[PDB]
Each structure stands twice: as structure tokens, then as C-alpha cells.
């Protein structure tokens, strides 16, 4: 199977607060594994999966120092951005970064990622070529030029192709057994809805990872049905359901399908 690492970083400024709060959260295969929070008593990168306790004090020292650098970086940047957007003192602002790499089943780099958002909106992002930048806003051109003139892309490229892959490989070796998936377990419930009609609700439960698809069909055609957003059980696994309104006494015509990477093939069921 394919793999990935991300680091999701946030800085937030607020009216009263002297200094922005900075949080960095790292992910391997979308499970959180390291975290830094400037609001902590003693701000440091802490392990967030039992398999990271392996890394020795050098690791945590250097990653923590790396964090303190970002904290500065995000802070100066937030200040610059205020100026670029002619925003005055007296508001809240957020600067966000996602960085990382995707590997294929072969463990070779498939894609690097480097993007940033301001006020929850795309500000500037490194293109898939890892050479050029995309930057929508007129304010953002100021940055794009700065970074073009400074060769920023090449140094991020080095990181994404190098350290990111190198250390994900290492985390993946250290972490086997995030390797496994949990298949969904499906059932259907019956609920009255109106006169003449009822509600069939296909539940999927106990699955990891989150990505899953639920469908309903009536003699072979899919439907257009209510679906909830996939939600955490709170125990590492996920839940989803999808529902359709059905005529009374015609419920054995309707079939639910569940699709998930953990399955040997999709599951098929109906109400019983």
C-alpha cells in the first residue's frame, strides 16, 4: 500500500494576545505522531504514537529547535501579511501551512506538497513540479516574487525529495503494525418516516482509514439519499451511514453497498 507524511502547522493571532500561538502536528498515513504547541508549559515536540518513544533525545532536541524557528517565521510572516492586506490592529488572523510527501506502494516519491493559507484561504502553494509557485491574490504576488528571487522552491524541493522521504521510510519501518487497516462492518436499520414510506439506513462501523463509500440501488441504479460525513468513533475507527426513503412493503428491492480498501471485495446487504 501507499504512504504519506504531513506536517500541518498553524499560527493564530488575536486582539489582546502579545504573541501568536503556534501549533505543529505531524502525520504518518494520516495518524498523528508528533505535536508541538507553543502554549504548553515547556513547549516541545512530543511523541503522539507509542512507536515514536523509540527516537532518542537528539531527535526531540533538534525538532523542537526547528519548531522554535517556525514560530518566529510564522510570526514575522503574520506581521508582513497585515501590511500586505492593509489590515489594521484589532483583529484575529491565521496563517496555516501543509507540507509533506506522498509515496506509492513502491515507497518512491509520488508527490511533494507545500502550501499555505491566510485567514483560511489559499495564499501561496508550491506546484507539483516543485519548481514554480501558484499565488492567486494580488497581495500574494509580493511573496511569490520574494521567493522566486530567493530560490525558495529549490530548498523546499530538497526537503520534500530528501528528508521527508528519508524519514518517512524510517518511520514506516519503525511503525509497522499503522500498517493494518480495519474493515467496515455493515448493517441496515428500519425507521418509520411518513405514511406510506419508511427509512432504510445503511450503517458502516469500526473501519480505518476514513475513506469509504456507501451507496443504495434499486434494480441496479444508484441514487441521489442522505449521507453523514465520516465521523470518528473516538477509538481510532470511523463511522458513516447513508439513508433512503422507501415505500412500505417494497424494502427487499433496495440494496446497500459498502466500498473500502480493507475489504476483499465490496459488501452487499439489505434490511432483514
Amino acid at each position: 500500500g501507499p504512504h504519506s507524511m504531513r506536517y500541518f502547522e498553524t499560527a493564530v493571532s488575536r486582539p489582546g494576545l502579545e504573541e501568536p500561538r503556534y501549533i505543529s502536528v505531524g502525520y504518518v498515513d494520516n495518524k498523528e505522531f508528533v505535536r508541538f504547541d507553543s502554549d504548553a508549559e515547556n513547549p516541545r515536540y512530543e511523541p503522539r504514537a507509542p512507536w515514536m518513544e523509540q527516537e532518542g533525545p537528539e531527535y526531540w532536541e533538534r525538532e523542537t529547535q526547528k519548531a522554535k524557528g517556525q514560530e518566529q517565521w510564522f510570526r514575522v510572516s503574520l506581521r508582513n501579511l497585515l501590511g500586505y492586506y492593509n489590515q489594521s490592529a484589532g483583529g484575529s488572523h491565521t496563517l496555516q501551512q501543509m507540507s509533506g510527501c506522498d509515496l506509492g506502494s513502491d515507497w518512491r516519491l509520488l508527490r511533494g506538497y507545500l502550501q499555505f493559507a491566510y485567514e483560511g484561504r489559499d495564499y501561496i502553494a508550491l506546484n507539483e513540479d516543485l519548481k514554480t509557485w501558484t499565488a492567486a491574490d494580488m497581495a500574494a504576488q509580493i511573496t511569490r516574487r520574494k521567493w522566486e528571487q530567493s530560490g525558495a522552491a529549490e530548498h523546499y524541493k530538497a526537503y520534500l525529495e530528501g528528508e521527508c522521504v528519508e524519514w518517512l521510510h524510517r518511520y514506516l519501518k519503525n511503525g509497522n503494525a499503522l500498517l493494518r487497516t480495519d474493515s467496515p462492518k455493515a448493517h441496515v436499520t428500519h425507521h418509520p418516516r411518513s405514511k406510506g414510506e419508511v427509512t432504510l439506513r445503511c450503517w458502516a462501523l469500526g473501519f480505518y482509514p476514513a475513506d469509504i463509500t456507501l451507496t443504495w440501488q434499486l434494480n441496479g441504479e444508484e441514487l441521489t439519499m442522505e449521507l453523514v460525513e465520516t465521523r470518528p468513533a473516538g477509538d481510532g475507527t470511523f463511522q458513516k451511514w447513508a439513508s433512503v426513503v422507501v415505500p412500505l412493503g417494497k424494502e427487499q428491492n433496495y440494496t446497500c453497498r459498502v466500498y473500502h480498501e480493507g475489504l476483499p471485495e465490496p459488501l452487499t446487504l439489505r434490511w432483514e
Binding site: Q96, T189, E229, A233
Partner: protein, 99 residues
Amino acid sequence: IQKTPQIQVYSRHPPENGKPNILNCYVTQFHPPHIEIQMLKNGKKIPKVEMSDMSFSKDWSFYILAHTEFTPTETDTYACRVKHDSMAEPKTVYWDRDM
């Protein structure tokens, strides 16, 4: 610009009357990240409500999971009550056992 919280309120395990369980309030898709979340029992604040650390999605919006131990009975109504700058008044959504 502000994005309004989407809220789901649901149990971790199939609910059964008299059986300890976890009640979850999953609040997603909001901005800015400042948010106040409360879980209610029969209109009253549940005290030891745990809160996951904040995180965000590929689309930059923030999400967060509030959860608490509970034991559903037949007569108790449970609710999640979210306050956020996108909304002028708090939003309460009620636990439906079938959802």
C-alpha cells in the same frame, strides 16, 4: 472569512438504555479556530467534557471532537451547544439515537 460549524452528535457504541457509552460531538468545517463547545444533559452542563486538540483538514477548515462518558436512559435528552463567531447565537443540536 468565517465558516459555520457543522455539528454531529452521536454515540461511540450502539446505544442501549442503562449501558455506559461515550457521547461525541464532532464539530467540523469552521473558521476561525476559536470555538466554545458544551455538552448538555437535560438542559444542564455536563462537567468533565474532554476535547481533542484542534486540527484542520486539507481544505483549511478546522475540526474538533468533544466527548464525554454517558449512560443513556429512555427519558434523558442530550445536546451539544456550539458558540462561534460565524453565528450570532449559540447552536444546539440534539442527540438522536437513530442517527
